[PDB]
């Protein structure tokens, strides 16, 4: 209950970091797509641009 909500909060915050990268960067977008589709593909070398 105590450690578990602290757990969820950390998750939520990391989700929020992932969300912004997916919304505004090519890297984030590409990464989601690769995860979502489950493409068995070598990790691509990426940096963040806007």
């Amino acid at each position: 209950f105590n450690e578990l909500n602290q757990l969820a909060e950390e998750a939520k915050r990391r989700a929020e970091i992932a969300r912004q990268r997916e919304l505004h960067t090519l890297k984030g977008h590409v990464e989601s797509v690769v995860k979502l589709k489950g493409l068995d593909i070598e990790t691509i070398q990426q940096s963040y641009d806007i």
């Binding site: 960067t25 977008h29 493409l39 070598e42 990426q46 940096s47 641009d49 806007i50």
Partner: protein, 237 residues
Amino acid sequence: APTAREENVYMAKLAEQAERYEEMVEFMEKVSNSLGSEELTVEERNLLSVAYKNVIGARRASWRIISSIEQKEESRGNEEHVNSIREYRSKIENELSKICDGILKLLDAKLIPSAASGDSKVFYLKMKGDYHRYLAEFKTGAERKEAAESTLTAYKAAQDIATTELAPTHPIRLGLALNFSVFYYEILNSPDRACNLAKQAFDEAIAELDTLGEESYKDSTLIMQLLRDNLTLWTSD
């Protein structure tokens, strides 16, 4: 009774949310053709950049996915598939060309000239390096040299103006720093210029936290951490 400009701008915002980015571009372009001596507002500016960013982004995404597949296939000896994939990369490369060139000629004919303040001028100079950079990403040899040259020229300009006229915390200044540093990393393959540029832009932003701004602060705050993300990844080799 809303103007044809005002109507197109609302239209752009609908398209963005609906994920209909080609139309978003169409609407934003119909706006920037109707303007005379006026430059675009901040909002319009942003709408335009986002539209082209997304139209082009979809294709860069496509290009990287396909490239990844090409390498998995090439290391399997599927000549047959490696042909199809190359044929296909090429068809996308074309699209990147035509899009980059539509926007790049707009920047040069209208948007850049009409830019009066630092803000405005940096915003478009950045965009100019950006779409040259997209070419550089996939172009090869001679055409890539040109692209890379054009990129360096446009960023380096934008940066001098930003360094003198925009706050170090300003999202347009930070954004440039971010992309310019990516340019050196990904296109010039100079990790030390990449890191030096990024760390600097980051550190000036921190030295001036007094100048984060009521609306500015979330954008500038995101970009700052994107530079840190890149740095963090670049440092660990």
